[PDB]
Structures are given as C-alpha cells and as structure tokens.
Design a protein around this ligand. Structure first.
Ligand SMILES: *[C@@H]1O[C@H](CO)[C@@H](O[C@@H]2O[C@H](CO)[C@@H](O[C@@H]3O[C@H](CO[C@H]4O[C@H](CO)[C@@H](O)[C@H](O[C@H]5O[C@H](CO)[C@@H](O)[C@H](O)[C@@H]5O)[C@@H]4O)[C@@H](O)[C@H](O[C@H]4O[C@H](CO)[C@@H](O)[C@H](O)[C@@H]4O[C@H]4O[C@H](CO)[C@@H](O)[C@H](O)[C@@H]4O)[C@@H]3O)[C@H](O)[C@H]2NC(C)=O)[C@H](O)[C@H]1NC(C)=O
Ligand SMILES: *[C@@H]1O[C@H](CO)[C@@H](O[C@@H]2O[C@H](CO)[C@@H](O[C@@H]3O[C@H](CO)[C@@H](O)[C@H](O)[C@@H]3O)[C@H](O)[C@H]2NC(C)=O)[C@H](O)[C@H]1NC(C)=O
Ligand SMILES: *[C@@H]1O[C@H](CO)[C@@H](O)[C@H](O)[C@H]1NC(C)=O
Ligand SMILES: *[C@@H]1O[C@H](CO)[C@@H](O)[C@H](O)[C@H]1NC(C)=O
Ligand SMILES: *[C@@H]1O[C@H](CO)[C@@H](O)[C@H](O)[C@H]1NC(C)=O
Ligand SMILES: *[C@@H]1O[C@H](CO)[C@@H](O)[C@H](O)[C@H]1NC(C)=O
Ligand SMILES: *[C@@H]1O[C@H](CO)[C@@H](O)[C@H](O)[C@H]1NC(C)=O
Ligand SMILES: *[C@@H]1O[C@H](CO)[C@@H](O)[C@H](O)[C@H]1NC(C)=O
Ligand SMILES: *[C@@H]1O[C@H](CO)[C@@H](O)[C@H](O)[C@H]1NC(C)=O
Ligand SMILES: *[C@@H]1O[C@H](CO)[C@@H](O)[C@H](O)[C@H]1NC(C)=O
Ligand SMILES: *[C@@H]1O[C@H](CO)[C@@H](O)[C@H](O)[C@H]1NC(C)=O
Ligand SMILES: *[C@@H]1O[C@H](CO)[C@@H](O)[C@H](O)[C@H]1NC(C)=O
Ligand SMILES: *[C@@H]1O[C@H](CO)[C@@H](O)[C@H](O)[C@H]1NC(C)=O
Ligand SMILES: *[C@@H]1O[C@H](CO)[C@@H](O)[C@H](O)[C@H]1NC(C)=O
Ligand SMILES: *[C@@H]1O[C@H](CO)[C@@H](O)[C@H](O)[C@H]1NC(C)=O
Ligand SMILES: *[C@@H]1O[C@H](CO)[C@@H](O)[C@H](O)[C@H]1NC(C)=O
Ligand SMILES: *[C@@H]1O[C@H](CO)[C@@H](O)[C@H](O)[C@H]1NC(C)=O
Ligand SMILES: *[C@@H]1O[C@H](CO)[C@@H](O)[C@H](O)[C@H]1NC(C)=O
Ligand SMILES: *[C@@H]1O[C@H](CO)[C@@H](O)[C@H](O)[C@H]1NC(C)=O
Ligand SMILES: *[C@@H]1O[C@H](CO)[C@@H](O)[C@H](O)[C@H]1NC(C)=O
Lengths: 964, 51, 51, 51, 101, 51, 51, 50
C-alpha cells in the first residue's frame, strides 16, 4: 500500500454504530494481494473464485498470497450505467431484480451513482425465495461481502450469509474512465485514524516499533521505557509430575445414535437423535453413578459423519466445568453423574448444525456433582503402572504438579525441604517440589519473564534483559554484572543521550554509568584565611513552574445523574435523599467554598489595568508575555499557545438548538454533568493576571501609569543585595537570554532550562489527562451496569415490572451512588490537595513575586530577582527570573582578623566577609562581588589579638578603612 | 427529547452515540438528512434569597 | 409541599433552607406523543398471542 | 433580582518601589479587625475491635 | 508558635497586612485564632526623592531596603515602608557613593 | 502480565480495554519517571565533597 | 485453570468479570499510589525544604 | 531478578514479584548515587565554598 494514498473510496467497516474522528486498532482485510486494475471494466466483468486471477499489478511487497477476501470498491462519476447483478454461491444461485420505474418489474437496472422497486430471488436447494430490496441506496461508493458471508455497506452490516463461490459485476460502461481499480485482498491487523468521516492514514503492525506503536493506539509513540513480553506462544512439550497411585479405571465414555435425515437444504422433515451414555452401565435402582476410586480419567466419543452439513456439540449448561476438559487434570469428588434428571445438578445443552441456518437443539444427560477430591481426569487413559512423571527441565514447558498447572522451565534444585511435599508463593504459585522417588527437588522458573525496552527517536535501540545475548540488527550487545544490558550497536561510549536514575545511554546505544548532574555549589564558611570564589557575570535563565490553583468545578444532580429524568427513579431516589442530598450538598458547598476562596484571592486595580501597555517594557520586548493592549475595548502569547494546545468552556444554552450536532461538553449538560463556568473565567481571570502583571512594574504610587522599567527592576533585586553598579549589562544580556528562552522554548511549545520546560509541559498535560480520564472514568462507570440487565433505566422499565424493576433499579443506584461517593471522595482528596497547593501557590505569588525571599532553594535555585506569572488550564505558571553562578571571581579572605590594639573585629552580620583585593580592604557580600565601601557601621570591638591577624593601629585604621 | 433537524454528511455510519452511549444524531435512510436529539428536560439552576 | 420554595425546602428535609444555588428539574412529566424512527424491513408476522 | 457583572473585591494595595522621585502614600490611622481562622488540629480518635 | 509568639516578617501569612498578635481558642477537634493586625485605612501623602547622592563624593544608597526618605519640609525624615513613624535621621543607616547626579 | 499472567487469550481480550489500562499504566509510569526525575534533580555530586 | 474449566463464551464471561474486578482494585491501588504521590510530594517539599 | 531465574536456589519473595509482574524498579536512590550524594552533602557540612 502506498503511503499518502487518499483511498477516499475505501472506507471503514464497523459492525456496530460508527465512531467519528477516532483512531482504533482493528483487523481489516488490508493485505492487498492483486490490485486488479479496472482497466475500463466492461459489461462482461468476470467471475472471481477466491483466486489470484486478478488483472493487476502486485506492487512489490505482498505481491501474491491466497486471496482471503474480495471487495468491490467503486470509483466512478455520478452516472447511470445499465447493469445487472448475479451472485454465485454454494447454496445456489442468487439473482437480483430491479425496476427504476415504479412498476415491480419496471426497468431492470440497478441505479449507479447517486439516487425504484428492486427484488432478489435466492434459490436454495430446489426452492427459490424472493427478497425485497426495500430501502434504496442514496449512492454506493464501496461494496463489500466476505467468504464468511458478512455484508457491510459503509458499516452497519445488514446481515451475513453462509459462503460464496463466484460473482459478476454485470455493468455496461459507457465512460472510458470507468474506474481506476477494483481488487482482491487478504485479512490483516492494522490501525485506523479517521476524522470527521475522512480517513487520514494507517499503520501496519509488523515491526517492533510498529507493534508497540499499535499498542500505544497512536502514531509516533514518544521516547521512553515500555514493557514487552515477546515470548513465543508456540506449543511445546509439557512435562507432567504426579503423585504415585495405581490408577483405577475412572474414565467417562460416550455414544450417540443420530438418525441420518438429509443434511442438505431440504430438511423439511429431519429426524432427531438419541444418545446412549457409555461411561458405565446403568441400573435403574439408583440413578446416579459413582467413582471406583480417586483417579484421573475422562474421554468423549461420538459419531457425527452422518450428514453432508452436520455437526453436533455441547458447550455448557448451568455448571462451570466444561465437558471434555474434565480429563485435563481436573479433580472432583463423588460427582455421581446420572442421565435421569435430579436436583442439585447442572444440565448440558446439545445442538445440531445445518450450515448455521437452524439449530436442532436437544438435551442430553444433565451432569451432577458433589464437591470432592476423589474424582479426577487425566488425558492419558491408563496410568496404572504409576511410573509416569514426564520431566523436561531447561526447555519451555507446561506443567501439572499435584493438580497445580503452570508454564515455565524446571530447574533442578538441591535442598532438603523436609517441611512438606510442596511450597507455594505468596500469590500461590508453587516455587518448587521435592521428588517422591529420591528427595530431590525442582524449582520452577517462569517461562516468559517480562522485558523492558527503550525507544529513542522513534527507534528502539537498547533493551534491559536477563540473558547474555545479541537480539538486534546492530553488531555488539555487551554484558553487565548482576544484570545485563542489551544494545547491539557498537560501544564507543562517547556520550549519553538518555538518562535514567540507575543508568545512562549513548546516542549509539552504548550504556554509561549513571552520572548525576555535576554541580559545584557554594556554601558559607566561617571566618578563615582561604582563596574564595564569588559569582560575578550572570545571565538570567527562566526556570518554569506550573502550579495547580483550582479544580474544574462540577455539580451533579442526583435525579439527573441517576434517574436520567425518570419520574419513577426520582420518587424512589427521594427516600435516600439524605445520603445523596448530603453528597451533593458537600460538593456544592465545597464548590462555593473554593469559588469564594479564589474570588477572595482575586483583586482588581484601576492603576494596574493600564500597566499592560507595551510602552512600559521598552527594550525588554517582553511582549509575548505582555497582556495585549485593549483593542478599542474596556492575553499573552504563552497563554494563547497553551490554549492552542488545549487539544486532547461554552454555554450549553446555545448548543441545545441549531443545525450542529452537539459537542462533547454539551453532551455533559445533557447527562447532567453540569460543568460550571470556571471560577477564573476568562474575564476576571484575565483582568486579574493583568492587574498583577502590571503590579510587577507598578508600585504604590499616586498615578495609574507605568514607571521606566529599567529603574524599576533595580528595586526587587535590592531586596537581596545593595547594587553598587550604575550600568547594567546584565539587563540586556538577560533579555537576550530570556527572549531566546522564549524563541526556543516557545518553539518547544509549538540547557537544563529545557528540561524544566519539558517537565512543566508534561505536568500540564498530566493534569489535563487526569481530569479527562477522571470524568471519562465516571462516564464509563455509567457505561457499565454493575449488575443490571442494561444501563438504560428507561429500557429497564420497559424490560421489567415495578417490583423487580425496583430491585434492579436500586441495585443500580446503590452501585452508582457507591462509585459516586468514590468520586466525591476523590474530589475531596483533590480539594485537600488543591488546598495545599493553593496555600503554596498563593504563598509564593504574594511573596517571591512581590518581594524576593531570603530563602535560597525556594524560587529560582539561587539568588532570585522576580517572577512572571500567567494562567494555564486550571492552574498558574510562573517564570522566576533569578541570579545564579556563571563566572566565579577569585578573592583572598582573612580569618576574621582582630586589630593589634584592644580593638578587634568580628562580624556585624553574618552575610558579609572581608577580602584583600590589594592594599586597601573591601567587604563584598556573600551573594555578590559588590564592592561595599568599608564602613564603621558594621564594626565591633574585641580585645584578644592573635598576632597572626591584622597589624594596624586604631589611627591608621582610618587609612585602612574609611570609617569616617 | 426533541428532534432537531441537522444538516451534515455523517457518512461514517448510520448512527453515532456519545461517550455515555446516548445517540447524538441519526441520518435518515430515505435522503441522507440527519436529526440531532436535544434533551427534553435540561437541568435548571435557581437561586433563593431571604427564604 | 406546594410552592417552589416549599418544594425545594421539602427536598431539603428541613425548614427555612439557607440562601444558595440549588438544582431543579421542573419539566412536566405529562405524556406526549412519541415519534418512532425505524430501519426499513417488511414485517413478517411475529406477534405472540394468548388465550 | 437585577444581575450585575461580577465585580471582584476592589482593593488598592501598596507595594515597595525603587528609589524614585514620586508622591507616596503611607498607612496612618488604623483600627483593628479580627480575621477569624479555624484550624483542624486533631481528629476524633476511634478504635474498632475486629470481633 | 510563630505568628502568635512573634509576628512573622511575611505579609500574607497571618492578618492580610502588618500583623500585631493572635488570640487562640479551642473548637470542635480544632483551633480558632483571632489575628489582630494593622492594615491601611487612611494613607498619608509624602514626597520621596530618587535615592539622592550628595554633591560631594559622599552619596547615599539604602542601608537596608525597608526604609525610604521623604521631604516633609526643609528637614528630612526617614519613615518606614510599613508606617509613617518619623525615625530621626541618623548616620547608622548611611553609606558613601561617589557618582553625583 | 498482571492480569493475563502470560495468557495470549487474556491478552487479546484485554487489548480492547487498553485505553483504561493503558491510561493507568501510563499514569503510574509517567509519575514514576516524574518522581525519578525530581529525585535525580535533587541529587548532586561534588568532587570537593567526595573526599 | 479457568480456561481449562470453561469454553470460550462463558470463559470470557468469568474472565472479564475477573478483569473488571482486578482493574477495579488496580485503580484503587493506583489511586492510593496517587495519594501517596501527592503526600510524598508534600513531604518531599518539606524535606527538600529543610535539608 | 535476572540472577534468580537461574541457579540451584529456590527463588526469594522479591523474585516471585518479578514472576508475577510486580517489577519493583531498582530504587531511584539506589545505593551508588544515593550514597555518593549523602556523602557529598555530609561533607558539605564541614566544607564551604573553598
Ligand atoms: C464483526 O463481527 C464479525 C462476526 O460477526 C467478526 O468476525 C469474526 O472475527 C474474528 C476475529 O475478530 C474471527 O476469528 C478469526 O478468524 C480468522 C480466520 O481464520 C479461520 O481459519 C483459520 C485456519 O483454519 C482458523 O484457525 C480460524 O479459527 C478457527 O480455529 C480456531 C482454533 O483456535 C477456533 O477457535 C475458531 O473457532 C475456528 O474454528 C478461522 O476459521 C483467523 O485468522 C483469526 O485468527 C487470528 O487471530 C487470532 C486472535 O488474535 C489469533 O489467535 C490467531 O492466531 C490469528 O492471529 C494471527 O493470524 C494471522 C494469520 O494471517 C497472523 O498473520 C498474525 O500473527 C495474526 O495475529 C481468528 O480466528 C472470526 O472468524 C470472524 N467471524 C467470521 C465468521 O468471519 C468481526 O471481527 C467483527 N468486526 C468488528 C468490527 O469487530
Ligand atoms: C489523524 O490525522 C492527522 C495525523 O496525520 C491529524 O489530524 C490531521 O492533521 C492534518 C495535518 O496535515 C490535517 O491536514 C490539514 O487540515 C487543515 C484543516 O482543514 C488544513 O487547513 C490543511 O491544509 C491540512 O489539510 C488534517 O485536517 C487533520 N485531520 C483531522 C483533524 O481529522 C491527527 O492528529 C491524527 N490523529 C491522531 C491523534 O493520530
Ligand atoms: C483457482 O481457484 C480454485 C478454487 O475455486 C483453485 O482450485 C485453483 O487452484 C485456483 N487457480 C489458481 C491458478 O490459483
Ligand atoms: C447482464 O445483464 C443484462 C441485462 O441486465 C443481460 O442482458 C446480460 O445477459 C447480463 N450478462 C451477464 C454476464 O450476466
Ligand atoms: C423470481 O423469479 C421468477 C422468474 O425467474 C419471477 O417469476 C418472480 O416474480 C421472481 N420473484 C420476485 C420478483 O419476487
Ligand atoms: C477515479 O477515476 C476518475 C477518472 O474518471 C478520476 O478522475 C478520479 O480521480 C478517480 N478517483 C480516485 C482516484 O479516487
Ligand atoms: C511422556 O513420556 C512418554 C515416554 O517418555 C512419551 O511417549 C510421551 O510422548 C511423553 N509426553 C509428554 C507430553 O511429555
Ligand atoms: C448404545 O446404543 C445402542 C443402540 O442405539 C444400544 O444397544 C446400547 O445399549 C447403547 N448404549 C451402550 C452403552 O452401548
Ligand atoms: C553469554 O553469551 C555469549 C554469546 O555467545 C557467550 O560467548 C558467553 O560465554 C555467555 N556467557 C555466559 C555467562 O552465559
Ligand atoms: C568506535 O569503535 C570502533 C571499534 O573499536 C572504532 O573503529 C571507531 O573508530 C570508534 N569510533 C569512535 C568515534 O571512537
Ligand atoms: C563536571 O565534572 C567533569 C569532570 O572533570 C568536568 O569535566 C566538568 O567541568 C563538570 N561539569 C561542567 C558542566 O563543567
Ligand atoms: C591562594 O592562597 C595562597 C595562600 O593560601 C596564596 O599564596 C596564593 O597567592 C593564592 N592564590 C592566588 C592566585 O593568589
Ligand atoms: C565579566 O565581568 C567583567 C567585570 O565587570 C566585565 O568587564 C566583562 O565585560 C564581563 N564579561 C562578560 C562577557 O559579561
Ligand atoms: C502607551 O503608552 C504610549 C507612551 O507611553 C502612548 O503613546 C500610548 O497611547 C499608550 N497606549 C494607549 C492605549 O494609550
Ligand atoms: C521587538 O521589536 C521589534 C521592533 O520594535 C519587532 O519587530 C519585534 O516583533 C519585537 N519582538 C517581538 C517578539 O514581537
Ligand atoms: C593564633 O596565632 C598563633 C601564632 O602565635 C597560632 O599558632 C594559632 O593557631 C592562632 N590561633 C587562632 C588563629 O585561633
Ligand atoms: C404514527 O403515525 C400514524 C400516521 O401518521 C398515526 O396514525 C399514529 O397515531 C402515529 N403514532 C405515533 C405514536 O406517532
Ligand atoms: C473600587 O472602585 C470603585 C470604582 O470607582 C470606587 O468607586 C471605589 O472607591 C473602590 N472601592 C472602595 C471600597 O473604595
Ligand atoms: C506630586 O508630585 C509633583 C511632582 O512630581 C509635585 O509637583 C506635587 O506637588 C506633588 N503633589 C503634591 C500634593 O504636593
Ligand atoms: C488620623 O491621624 C492623625 C495623625 O495623628 C490624627 O491627628 C487624627 O486624630 C487621626 N484621626 C483618627 C480618626 O484617628
């Protein structure tokens, strides 16, 4: 199949109601075998016999295979071409009549293209029946029928037939460009993306990447670690271990007598059948039989080769055990089967087949049983010698040991294990068993250990395995200690392009010892003589955060959500209002509570309103983040991109009318999930985000206008330390780095900073996923009926009279209220958590944003300057501009020198430190190299002079320090 | 509910149901026109003040 | 339980319900003609009867 | 019963500004207003005998 | 143990403004507090200079961020950023800076 | 693994309900990777500190 | 053993009621994992915040 | 678990978890970097920017 093939004529096939604009993995007859190009198909189309006789190119891959399916895709203009349809099938011929004119006979032409009384005569055996066309197709663009006989026209299969042999497309084509192609093809498994009635593309599920991708139910699965179990399911010899006992003959047998009435179409009068049980001899004194001893045996014998189209079988009656597998290591006690009906036992259905048209149901011996350990079934008929305990060790095996069945490889183990014959794990799977003959034991090792594998750049390189083996197309797959690493690519170990907590991985697939992010932080030290380093030249790096600040308010009406508008369900529900009333009251009051809380946080300033003007920022060109200037009226680029990525709020009032099909959100109103308009709805939310964002360059001032930003930022930083510089190059270089973070990071929207933004983006998409799948988990709990016949309360009322109607209704409502309390308790856990995070967000916007904290490690991972903020889906996002070390500056520091005189210095406040840059001394901060002039206001006297300290008199201290 | 005439091709299939499973609209067999289903009884929110 | 206030109040299972927003579905339950949409098929007589 | 566009609580807070020449406003005459809080501090201890 | 014992230096913590102290009582399975606080009710006009440096090599920058000069008259006073308290001007909060604008 | 226990048939039936399970295991997986990222971010190493 | 006990149709019936219950308990467990994540997140904030 | 799906010993409880698919991931703060970190900080207590 070509990539980018429009295949507009091709279409989806669905048994049930079609989905719209979704991607689903499914089995389709897409292994195209022969294109069978139309080549101007004429009146004598021809007959297909499920053979590759197709007039077409094979397109290389999938050139030719036994054609499993035939379809009739039609590619033609809206024209009427005279034609007939003839169908050939095993049962007999099928002819199709039609009449474009109203008369039943009319004119014998099927309408072609857009659009009549048509009929069909199907002859079965020697009997001919007539089928009415009924509904007239508007236009047929794709036709389809299978060998199995299922018929779907654009889905919604009308019916299905037995089988077919040939077909004819008896169409006389006036147009030369009648079709491009009409082909045969074969089954496959694929995936499908269709949107708004138009298919987009598909992915064959062949490669490992395409395999996992199909499991991902999407395209281009992102890079990460995923679990695969590729163990071959090919059947292998299964060793048996059993307990010694001389097998008495306890095997059930069966016979039957089926009078052979003709199994062809004409079974008007067709005989029934009478089966005679062969398990044992029956004496009518006691109806139930018994078991000779506790032994394993069961067998089934029957004769069905009596009719041309006949099969006889039994599935299951009212008992769990499925007959015929009784011999598969089953254990019972005194089942005491009897033919004659008795209470306390199940029954078994028997059926006869006539090409699926009719089921000649009969009832054979009902099977009775008692719970016990004696009666048992073995596939082998005789085990009397009791020396049969099949045993395969290293090979994959299936095993039954003392009535425990599992799959794995037996590993010889040497341990006394004298406690008991066998031991099982916490789950209950046996770990090992000791042999009866000699006391040796065998451990069971799982056959198919789960595998973890890594995909990078839409390619799987590297895999974490338990075996020393090379399973990849590349050259070398090294080994490791206590665990193995699989990557067949070569190992130059140049550098690691991936990083997990306990390993690293190169671009080429070479594994690297996990190296943590190397960072050289600086921490304060006591007054000492040492060579020290201060951060000098910084450039600003946005460290993006995302903060949950509210949750999507939702209200549920008890009656709407459970009654669905049903008066009777309303009446019964009302007596249990106290519980439900309590529930909906809790969620309602908590909604009103959290809405109060947000509104309380919400503030509005007339001074702030104007501050969004683009003139305030100047060279900063913050713009993107700048709230837009009012467009002759009374929103930032990031918020807008985020909204543009809101893929995967309106008033339902306007969607319960109009020519459009209702949107998903509108369906929620219909189902009673009234999603309240967001507390931080656009209007006041934006007015607020704007008021604060202008409050960042607006301080308590008489006017309502902006102040030059360049002087303004200087103040926020001063909170951390007194700037002694006049010319701020940092401003412009942090602007170039900031706006480069916006260029590049906003391209990432549509450097560890990049990891930070990747985390934030993953966080927002997490909260959107968790809300989506929360309410989808609710509406799926409505898609499931706990115990009911069906989910529709209405249809239940149709199905049921009041008394038992109320019985299944109230077990429904009990389960729905249960899940509903689960949901409201998750809402309460979400409320307490969003309350904690509101405390924290509210706690940082009002602090860190307004006035830099004196807590490093709070906001900015270093000295913090200020923070920007915007809105986000149900949360806030901040941009904490900060000051971090980029270039250190050498300095020499004294050990808190005391003057030779009784004067001696200790620190006036801990955050400073002297250093000796030259003859003169300067006292730079612990957080910057700012050269504070030396001054007396920070001095203290201390007597004890250690001669190892400064040599200065109190006079020339003034020449050393300019105290006054 | 109330049937509202809707004009859309909806060529995928005869009918479509929502996430809950309630059908949204169906296309007519005769002519390809479709009808949306609008809920009969939309829930109402009301305010009480000073009793 | 006659008025709207007394109706909701009865639902509140109390007296003098406090001020707030509450959900009501007052749609009339009076039976109305119900339209039927079906799939075309010539109906064979498959109706059970009793005596 | 007249509806009004939601107006948020109007508040004119004061925030610090860098050394600049401007006309500024300081809070002078205050009177104290209790802002009540409620803090959960324990939960009602409960014990259940299995038997 | 904090706000009640010693007013925090974090506004927005307790009191929605300058905080004075908090009362406390018991409550069903919880505590209730009464954080007495100081908030703006009447503002007081003032004029503030742009961190003026003296004409001589002496020039002033802020000794700690929480104060600000203002010119109430010929004499200068240095009221706080949180009250109109007239701190007497004093050298203990001064610094030298050369560049005079 | 956890539900099929390695059973191919249980795998086939489970796959149609992947969306729920896929969503589950994706949530726990991404959150595992998230918390592992967070710890690794906290994790630092100093050559000065080693000694 | 259920597959041994059962033919496909009712085998799938008890299989999927099994998987429904197992997915239920599994969602319970992943939701306790999420509550553990939010709580270990609070306590990470606090620990990280004190170290 | 790679080393406990072979050998003469009966599998330990944790190994049973791999068999049942409860793949307990190696701890994020595995011994190696966790110890290197706890050490780096504990030395950072008597080590300052120097
Ligand atoms: C709309 O409804 C209709 C029904 O009204 C559905 O149609 C049914 O769909 C199912 C699958 O969903 C069909 O079952 C499949 O039948 C395929 C045809 O194979 C036939 O011949 C082979 C060979 O003789 C038989 O083995 C098949 O099965 C018979 O034997 C098994 C033995 O276990 C019995 O259990 C059966 O009862 C039959 O007696 C068929 O007779 C068949 O290929 C397919 O098997 C594949 O898929 C299963 C499940 O994954 C695998 O176990 C199996 O190994 C195959 O998987 C691999 O096979 C391909 C071969 O190309 C490999 O390349 C790949 O590795 C692949 O994974 C399965 O048995 C059923 O027949 C069909 N009903 C009819 C009568 O058509 C539609 O699906 C449904 N559509 C929608 C939209 O839901
Ligand atoms: C399924 O289809 C594609 C993935 O290939 C995704 O949606 C489709 O995206 C393409 C982008 O090229 C859209 O094409 C463009 O449509 C716009 C809108 O009319 C048009 O202006 C452009 O000229 C171009 O034709 C296409 O319409 C769109 N199809 C849809 C929306 O159904 C989608 O992500 C895929 N689904 C998934 C989740 O795998
Ligand atoms: C044609 O199809 C028939 C089945 O009807 C088959 O016996 C024969 O082998 C096919 N011929 C070819 C050439 O495939
Ligand atoms: C095709 O149909 C026409 C009339 O509809 C008939 O005359 C002709 O014999 C048919 N041919 C075949 C091959 O069925
Ligand atoms: C079936 O065909 C016969 C002759 O071929 C015709 O007389 C009869 O009317 C057909 N059945 C219909 C049209 O229902
Ligand atoms: C079908 O063939 C016609 C030629 O009459 C052509 O114009 C049209 O593009 C084709 N449809 C396809 C390729 O879908
Ligand atoms: C069991 O053992 C016997 C003899 O060793 C052999 O004939 C039979 O095929 C074996 N079957 C299995 C399933 O191991
Ligand atoms: C089997 O059928 C034959 C005749 O139908 C009858 O003689 C016999 O008793 C039946 N049962 C057994 C166990 O042979
Ligand atoms: C691992 O497999 C390689 C590949 O043949 C082999 O050379 C090596 O001896 C094996 N080592 C062990 C311990 O199994
Ligand atoms: C990688 O290793 C191979 C084999 O030792 C060597 O030929 C090649 O030059 C190496 N490449 C680099 C980039 O080190
Ligand atoms: C971390 O350590 C390595 C080891 O020498 C060193 O080369 C490097 O400079 C450090 N990391 C960075 C980003 O400088
Ligand atoms: C480092 O300190 C030593 C004394 O501790 C001093 O001699 C040396 O000059 C200092 N380094 C530099 C670059 O000055
Ligand atoms: C680094 O700092 C020094 C000191 O002011 C300055 O002269 C130099 O230009 C700075 N370099 C950069 C790239 O900022
Ligand atoms: C923004 O400010 C500039 C100059 O400060 C001014 O020209 C412009 O009119 C202002 N915006 C509006 C909407 O008035
Ligand atoms: C920055 O300013 C220039 C000219 O004023 C403008 O062209 C550019 O678009 C601005 N930046 C952004 C991101 O719009
Ligand atoms: C004080 O100086 C003496 C030298 O006389 C030196 O031995 C001693 O270590 C110093 N003590 C300090 C700096 O505490
Ligand atoms: C259905 O339609 C017929 C004729 O239009 C009318 O007699 C009958 O009462 C209708 N019933 C309903 C339930 O619409
Ligand atoms: C909030 O704004 C309005 C708008 O002019 C103003 O009248 C009022 O003084 C402000 N609120 C208060 C409580 O003063
Ligand atoms: C406000 O400031 C201006 C200069 O910025 C000054 O002339 C005016 O006197 C100030 N307002 C008052 C009331 O003094
Ligand atoms: C307001 O403050 C001034 C300044 O002390 C004072 O004289 C006046 O009495 C105060 N007014 C009130 C109502 O407290």
């Amino acid at each position: 199949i070509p990539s980018d093939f429009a295949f507009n004529n091709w279409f989806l096939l669905t048994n049930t109601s079609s989905v719209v604009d979704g991607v689903v993995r499914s089995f389709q007859p897409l292994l195209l075998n022969c294109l069978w190009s139309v080549s101007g198909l004429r009146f004598t189309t021809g007959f297909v016999y499920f053979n590759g006789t197709g007039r077409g190119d094979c397109k290389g891959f999938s050139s030719d295979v036994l054609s499993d399916v035939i379809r009739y895709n039609l590619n033609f203009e809206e024209n009427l071409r005279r034609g007939t349809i003839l169908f050939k099938t095993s049962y007999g011929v099928v002819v199709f009549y039609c009449t474009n004119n109203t008369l039943v006979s009319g004119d014998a032409h099927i309408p072609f293209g857009t659009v009549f009384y048509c009929f069909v005569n199907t002859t079965i055996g020697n009997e001919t029946t007539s089928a009415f066309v009924g509904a007239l197709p508007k236009t047929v663009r794709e036709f389809v029928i299978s060998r199995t006989g299922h018929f779907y026209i654009n889905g919604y299969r009308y019916f299905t037939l037995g089988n077919v042999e040939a077909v004819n497309f008896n169409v006389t084509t006036a147009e030369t460009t009648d079709f491009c192609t009409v082909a045969l093809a074969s089954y496959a498994d694929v995936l499908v993306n269709v949107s708004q009635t138009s298919i987009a593309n598909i992915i064959y599920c062949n490669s490992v990447i395409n395999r996992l991708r199909c499991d991902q139910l999407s395209f281009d699965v992102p890079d990460g670690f995923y679990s695969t179990s590729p163990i071959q399911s090919v059947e292998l010899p299964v060793s048996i271990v059993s307990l010694p006992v001389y097998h008495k003959h306890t095997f059930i047998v069966l016979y039957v007598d089926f009078k052979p009435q003709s199994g062809g179409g004409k079974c008007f009068n067709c005989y029934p059948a009478g089966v005679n049980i062969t398990l044992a001899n029956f004496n009518e004194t006691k109806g139930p039989l018994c078991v000779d001893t506790s032994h394993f045996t069961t067998k089934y014998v029957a004769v069905y080769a009596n009719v041309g189209r006949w099969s006889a079988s039994i599935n299951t009656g009212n008992c769990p055990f499925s007959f015929g597998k009784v011999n598969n290591f089953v254990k019972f006690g005194s089942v005491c089967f009897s033919l004659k009906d008795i209470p306390g036992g199940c029954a078994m259905p028997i059926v006869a087949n006539w090409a699926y048209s009719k089921y000649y149901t009969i009832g054979s011996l009902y099977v009775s049983w008692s719970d016990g350990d004696g009666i048992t079934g073995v596939p082998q008929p005789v085990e009397g010698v009791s020396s049969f305990m099949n045993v395969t060790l290293d090979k994959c095996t299936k095993y039954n040991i003392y009535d425990v069945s599992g799959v794995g490889v037996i590993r010889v183990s040497n341990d006394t294990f004298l406690n008991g014959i066998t031991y099982t794990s916490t789950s209950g799977n046996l770990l090992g068993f000791k042999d009866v003959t000699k006391g040796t034991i065998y451990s069971i090792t799982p056959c198919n250990p789960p595998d973890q594998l890594v995909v990078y750049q839409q390619a799987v390189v590297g895999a974490m395995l338990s075996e020393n083996f090379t399973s990849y197309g590349f050259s070398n797959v090294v080994e490791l200690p206590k665990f193995f690493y699989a990557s067949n690519g070569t190992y130059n170990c140049t550098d690691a392009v991936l990083t997990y907590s306990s390993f690293g991985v190169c671009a080429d697939g070479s594994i690297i010892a996990v190296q943590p992010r190397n960072v050289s932080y600086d921490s304060v030290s006591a007054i000492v003589t040492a060579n020290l380093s201060i951060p000098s030249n910084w450039t600003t790096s946005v460290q993006v955060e995302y903060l949950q600040i509210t949750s999507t308010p939702i209200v549920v009406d008890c009656s709407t959500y459970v009654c669905n508008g049903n008066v009777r369900c309303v009446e019964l529900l009302k007596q249990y209002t106290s519980a439900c009333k309590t529930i909906e009251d809790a969620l309602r009051n908590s909604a009103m509570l959290e809405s109060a809380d947000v509104s309380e946080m919400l503030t509005f300033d007339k001074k702030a309103f104007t501050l969004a003007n683009v003139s305030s920022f100047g060279d900063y060109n913050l713009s993107s983040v700048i709230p837009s200037l009012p467009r002759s009226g009374s929103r930032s680029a990031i918020e807008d991109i985020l909204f543009s990525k809101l893929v995967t709020d309106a008033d339902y009032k306007k969607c319960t009318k109009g020519l459009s099909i209702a949107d998903l959100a509108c369906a929620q109103y219909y189902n009673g999930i009234m999603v309240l308009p967001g507390v931080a709805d656009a209007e006041r939310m934006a007015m607020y985000t704007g008021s604060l964002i202008g409050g960042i360059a607006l301080g308590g001032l008489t006017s309502a206008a902006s102040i030059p930003f360049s002087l303004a930022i200087q103040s926020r930083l001063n909170y951390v330390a007194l700037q002694t510089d006049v010319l701020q190059e940092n401003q412009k270089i942090l602007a170039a780095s900031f706006n480069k973070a916006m260029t590049n990071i906003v391209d990432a929207f549509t450097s560890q900073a990049l990891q930070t933004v990747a985390t934030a983006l993953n966080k927002i998409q997490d909260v959107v996923n968790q809300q989506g799948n929360s309410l989808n988990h609710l509406t799926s709990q409505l898609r499931q009926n706990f115990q009911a016949i069906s989910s529709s309360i209405q249809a239940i009322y149709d199905r049921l009279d009041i008394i038992q109607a109320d019985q299944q209704v109230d077990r429904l409502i009990t389960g729905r209220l249960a899940a509903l309390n689960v949901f409201v308790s998750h809402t309460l856990t979400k409320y307490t958590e969003v309350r904690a995070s509101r405390q924290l967000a509210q706690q940082k916007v009002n602090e860190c944003v307004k006035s830099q904290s004196k807590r490093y490690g709070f906001c900015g991972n270093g000295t913090h300057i200020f923070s920007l903020v915007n809105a986000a889906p149900e949360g806030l996002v901040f941009l904490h501009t900060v000051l971090l070390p980029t270039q250190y500056k050498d300095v020499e520091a004294w050990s808190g020198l005391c003057v030779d005189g009784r004067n001696g210095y200790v620190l006036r406040q801990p955050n400073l430190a002297l250093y000796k840059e030259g003859n003169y001394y300067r006292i730079t901060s612990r957080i910057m190299f700012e050269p504070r002039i030396p001054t007396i206001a920070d001095f203290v006297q201390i007597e004890n002079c250690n001669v190892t300290f400064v040599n200065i008199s109190r006079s020339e201290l003034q020449t050393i320090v300019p105290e006054y």
